[PDB]
Homo-oligomer: A and B are copies of this chain.
């Protein structure tokens, strides 16, 4: 994960639309927390109907 988002940093991406199952959704979110890339200036879109079902 860290390698992945680090790879995203080379493009300096501010915007990603996640498209995953709710479990991996929660995990990836947790990793985003740990790397801290959820400060203002980033944005996310969770492509599923469970957007409320997951923790936010």
A: residues with CB less than 8 A from B are: 33, 36, 38-39
Contacts and interface: CB of A to CB of B under 8 A. Distances in A.
A36 B39 CA distance: 6
Q: Interface on chain A toward B: helix, strand, loop, or mixed SS?
A: loop
A33 B29 CA distance: 13
Contacts of A38: 36
A33 B33 CA distance: 7
Contacts of A33: 33, 36
Contacts of A36: 33, 36, 38-39
Nearest to A39: B36
A33 B36 CA distance: 8
A28 B33 CA distance: 16
